[PDB]
């Protein structure tokens, strides 16, 4: 059994677990044949995946480079030090003014670790309201329930959009902050199509003596390439995931000011007080052993973020989204804020007489991956009135402006099918919509035809991270 | 532009990032050449790593199978459902009595998610004291500082070993619980060498109406193979990491009772109330998108845990540690609790007149990877008096009992060198010990000789997860 | 020896403690010869004082009538039950819809006991901002310090005046409450000259599902007499002191809704859930033995509150304050909100070119007792711009409208002296003002003349609660 | 006409006597006066206040608002209120022989329970840890208390409490277990104070534990403060950081409280820096503006009177008699076959463990009440439930104030014993085993009712002979 279990440890996935191998092959074909429009998704490189799938996973390395609680970490230290160096370089940060923690396991715990580092329990946080494009890891509660645990352990209050313009209502943010006295204000969003006024957030944070946390998860790759303004110009702390526009592994980073404070902010302490608190909140506070396979893959992704090819990619992401929005507007769709400055759009389906749940069900059946999304003016969060879509993932496969014009066309055809399913539905209920969607033979034929059109279009483009020639599912 | 960055996305790690490729090859050689004795470390299979390094990383799948927020999750749902099914099967659990969450990113957040699910902020937790072999994610504070964030957000109090026997003092645990009124008691440890009396903990939890949480991270593979008694016989909730004795990817699982608990005095069924609370604490409470590459690799590892070869491995892990302990004792070392019933030992160096920091520095230089560790009787956590070592990792490479007798010999030779360095150190500070260790030619030669002995012994064994023939650093 | 301490226990205050007896005689003369304008002060009756100074103080009576810890409480129960029933009658409350607790020791703990009964620690409270006329027992924090412990144990946020009108800005209160989600809103003030819009507060509390607490301490006697609108029409809970306009002993009452609240969606009766929680928060939650002497004096005060002459008194309080306000306005003073609808006025002195601290120092020296008071627009609570004055105390002595016209004249003469002291001061500091006020023979003579005028006017009126003829200090 | 008629009417209302204005309340007070005349008042927390204190508490000092502290007020008109509070503080320090450079005092706290809560609020953050004597072992609710069911005291809601307990073999506090518990629990504050404990505290031992844990030592001396002031037992001020007390109970003052706290140098630390005590500002600010508003100046003035009395030789003689009476009481109970918790007493009370008499405290307390002997049932070591107590608590302060001496408390023990004999007869005649069957017999058995009537007459006849405290017998409305 000794030599036998060594064979099982060194055999390939195809031989050891054909069921799992088949699932991955099906997912490869899904990524090949679909319109992947979820703006938080991307296709990471083969080189990142080879690092994440390496023996770096075997090592325990609690602590920080050169200051570990375990032996054997000479090369894990090289990886984490290299990752930190490349993280600062990717955002053109002076290492005497900025530090970074690369151990946070994902975006949601990264933010919680910042709160734990800098705030006592029940201290006050302001952030963009979830139904107005915020994120759960900034806090969220309903009339009856705290949904995010951020709102359990800390005291949260939202700020909102101007529902007439679709931009953040900074005037109301400032006035609210005077009364609520936040200790930390979050500048970051999941479904905001415009650029943040980081200068205004900084002004409010200075008046309130609040920490300015920029959560740039969605835009980090755009920031790294220098194609939009950087939150590092203003923020005290910057969190980000590594798997969205950055195009890296699933993970996160926390950046923070260090060294001497501004002349007019030096007092009983002259140095920033973020580095030790954040590093200690990550470990020993809330995490144990770093995931060194992810950290090593992150180092790879951060080197890729420096290249001219990467800047060209992020430029194309923005130009594709601009064209995408223009085509949607010309086909009659309403966009929240009327357009976009970044990688995503938010379609408000109110002017079409159908909701996001119904449209997304059709999108899924025609191999278009998006998400239903609350829009300003929605009466209920349970019934989202919009669809969120973006350009990072298909841009990575080589979609350019005319290709996203085609994506908008096929989105439009899917909405028209959803409207027919609604018209053919007997009752008002979503259950009746689904029953029509699964029983009507003519409308199933139209969805089947649209699905073939999407797949034929998407299949022409390169696959990212694997070769077409060795795919199990080539049809 | 297009074809340029698409080639970057599909190129190998060797092509794209030679510096990172070099670091991984160095780490491969280190895992080949050394005694990897950290008891929380293992060598996972190639098939696990191929799944972790797959395109499953690209998908956002917030929610649970068949109840996602995004579209496109048909195959991610297969993987997570398969992982859940295999998790219950690996521990012989009745799915009508047990459920499982496989999304928790690692062991430390998994425990925090259980606390957040079942306890209000500042409610009370008892667990094994960190200096007596507990874990930071069960709580820990000094008289001046909360070290673990568990002790910030919840109210923790330790239970302790009988310092005469090295076993948990269950009588004092019970008496303390009467006074402290815990809402949850943790049964699990990082450096405890004996089996838990889960039945006794169950009786205390019943008396206190406290949740019984077994944290089986270290022993989960032993439990899965059935070679030690199972905490599932008694516990309400069981947490575990997946990368230690289980031999899987870096990740975690939370198991919990579900279904009928009891009939009340009025004949009405009373159901367990763990499942919804725990699942909602993981998401949307504390995490965002699941790491589907890790969940997929975990499904692979859980299938591997079912084989007769895996059971033979875990039986060898136990026999190896017994022989290891026996040989250390014969060579004059003291072990906490005087021996072992599991996969690890904790050496208390007090009778040798040297601390764990000094010994671990020599171990590191002779390529024995272990950790300095606090022991009962240490006056300061800054000066650990022990060394923790265990058998899972080298047993995975085929070490058997006589091989761990040799590991004990080489550990002893390293301690003898550390004692010589201490004797030659003119000063008493650790930096004086380091200065002697780095400048004394005779003792550098002794360490070089022992390092060569360790490497010659370790290199003869198979490498796990890669082949020797293609190693870049064979010399 | 036994005879020795019996004599000590039964001797008069004059025999036992001449120093304390003399202090009381000096205070009697001060209450006789001065203008007592502090609007939270009154002169309570001889009969109340005889009950408060009775042997009812000797009994320990933890618990509630008929449910005491100890025996011997048959007559204490007569008094407390009588007090409770008289309390409901004093405010014309239906005892099937309202209950009352009469044990709370004073106004500040009464509010804290309500919060403890109905809110978990760190739950949210809104109340009128302290510098805008609120009270510390509703919460208060500065930029750097929690001043009220209500703001330590609960999460507080103020609502504010419209600084253009001096009335509460109910529109902003409602908007703030949407974002802050208070669990309790306080409707009550210490330095607000207008009537509360209780119906508007009720509307906001209904929308927010918040408890409506009316703190009527200042206006309780006006409410009992039925000469201003009652908060009991709208509030869930009503707190009050017993020593202000109610004219009773120093103490407090907590009223709460009980019985049927409404019918739910299933047609089921929903009952109020305040009574048990509040009674248990008072005892055993936060207090021990009731002060039976105060409760007995309170019963006496509540019987007085039901009489026609008590209503005539409170009607006179209102007419006196209206005349007072009219006379101040005619003499060029600015009043916050432009006037009054209750028992007090708040004079904003800024248009006269002097502050409240300086004016109050002169008032004190001419035997006019008022308080310096923050006004809306003050930047520092350390430099108050206003003076607060009211009519309950002097109305009790028989001052009528023409007499308060005279009070306004003498106030104005004191302001003129303060302005002369400021003009003569050799410096701008309060310390320089005081030095001039104490050394300038001419201004000292003017203050002596005004003091004689105040005392000659006040001495004409009856003494309340003691006989003028037997006073020690009749000169 | 009517306006002036009304004004004259409400002024007449304010100046009329209680007898004229509210005869119903006056009658209640007269009934309570007669009750205090006729009973054996053995509840050890009760006492009889002096006339001079009551005259100050019932004075026009009640009319004044004086938020803040002497010389630092937020209202005008406080020249004489300042004299009273300053005098009260001075006499408070003098009553316990305290150096004002080492001790400060706050005299504004409204009663014993909020006084402790104010100390916790001053010195502890929310949810920080407190240890105190368990309530059924002799503690007090204001130190925290929770059952398996729920948190009873709000101290246990806002702070994290854990009890320490008696050695149930000896009846003394188990100081060894307290120390071991503190190592694990890490209290920030330990309370040394009891309400139903017949022994004095080992303040030296508490001090050692507090020093080792870097915890505040709070002595809550409510039950013993008058003994401390008279110098007849050791003082908590020798050891404690902060001392709270009721001003009623042992001290025999008005209903109120005091908070004492160390001032000045705590230690010179390892770096050579003076560490000063940080209690005065935190406690004073917790009382106001933190948790209270206007001081109750009538109570503060009555307290100054009580504190002057506490320094006299008559008061010292009284507190000496309190202790000697309790010892004689204990002597007589032991001679009559009763067991005392801890085997005796060192203070003003005893805890009778009724186990060897075959009857519990609930039954005995009911008979005592019917014969006008005021005592209270009390948990004793060995009880299975805190709800069915096996003992009775009795003490000497109140009757000693009326002039009971040693031979009189021998008689009190005799009449207590006669009541126990009646309770045992009721239990023997009870058709059933539950407490309601006992009450059914107690209310129905004509012969046993007659014995209780006889014993009640004996109790009242004995008590009536002694002086009344705080009022004259001659002017009582109820002279029978
Ligand atoms: C003690 N206290 C409460 C307070 C203030 N004025 C009163 N005035 C009266 N007549 N009565 C009171 N009971 C009263 N209480 C205070 C203390 C300081 C500040 C204060 O200075 N606040 C400033 C600055 C303090 C800071 O920022 O640190 C602010 O931020 O608005 C206010 C109120
Ligand atoms: C408020 N309080 C003190 C209390 C209650 N009632 C009294 N009743 C009287 N007549 N006298 C008292 N001194 C008295 N004291 C309480 C409240 C609940 C429990 C209680 O429930 N104890 C549990 C046992 C303790 C536990 O569960 O930890 C029980 O079995 O009833 C005890 C005391
Ligand atoms: C601004 C921001 N901060 C944090 C996170 C969380 O990252 P995680 O999913 O890795 O936890 C997200 C993820 N956002 C996902 C939903 O979770 C999205 O599709 O937009 C985010 O948008
Ligand atoms: C019982 C238990 N529960 C949880 C964890 C945390 O797992 P994580 O490191 O993946 O967070 C550990 C890790 N234990 C590591 C140190 O963190 C070890 O070397 O032993 C653990 O031992
Ligand atoms: C609305 C309200 N609620 C509560 C209180 C507190 O009463 P207390 O001083 O008896 O604690 C007050 C007292 N107000 C006093 C200052 O404390 C005053 O001069 O106005 C109050 O105005």
Numbering used by the authors:
A (entry chain B), B (entry chain A), C (entry chain C): 43 to 517
D (entry chain D): 38 to 517
Quote the passages of the study that discuss this structure, keeping the authors' original sentences.
Serine hydroxymethyltransferase (SHMT) reversibly interconverts serine and tetrahydrofolate (THF) into glycine and 5,10-methylene-THF (5,10-meTHF). Next, we have obtained high resolution crystal structures of AtSHMT2 complexed with MTX and PTX, as well as of AtSHMT4-MTX complex. For clarity, in this work we divide THF, MTX, and PTX molecules into three moieties: (i) pteridine or its mimic (P-moiety); (ii) benzoyl (B-moiety); and (iii) glutamate (E-moiety).
Interfaces between subunits A/B and C/D are much more extensive than e.g. between A and D. In the crystal structure of AtSHMT2-MTX complex, we noted two binding modes of MTX, one corresponding to external PLP-Ser aldimine state (EA-type; chains A, B, C) and the other to PLP internal aldimine + free serine state (IA-type; chain D). In this case, direct hydrogen bonds dock exocyclic N4 of MTX to Oε of Glu104* (an asterisk indicates a residue from another, tightly bound subunit), and N2 of MTX to backbone O of Lys414. A network of water-mediated hydrogen bonds link the antifolate to Thr416, Ala423, and Glu104*. Tyr111* π-stacks with the pteridine ring. B-moiety is sandwiched by the side chains of Ile189 and Tyr182 from one side and Ala423 from the other side. The IA-type binding mode (chain D) is characterized by fewer H-bonds. In the P-moiety, exocyclic N2 H-bonds to carbonyl O of Tyr111* and to Nζ of Lys414. The pteridine ring is again stacked with the side chain of Tyr111*, however, it is rotated by 66° with respect to the ring in the EA-type binding. The two Oε atoms of the E-moiety are also involved in binding; Oε1 to the backbone amide of Asp185 and to (apparently protonated) Oδ of Asp185, whereas Oε2 interacts with Nη of Arg223 from the A-chain.
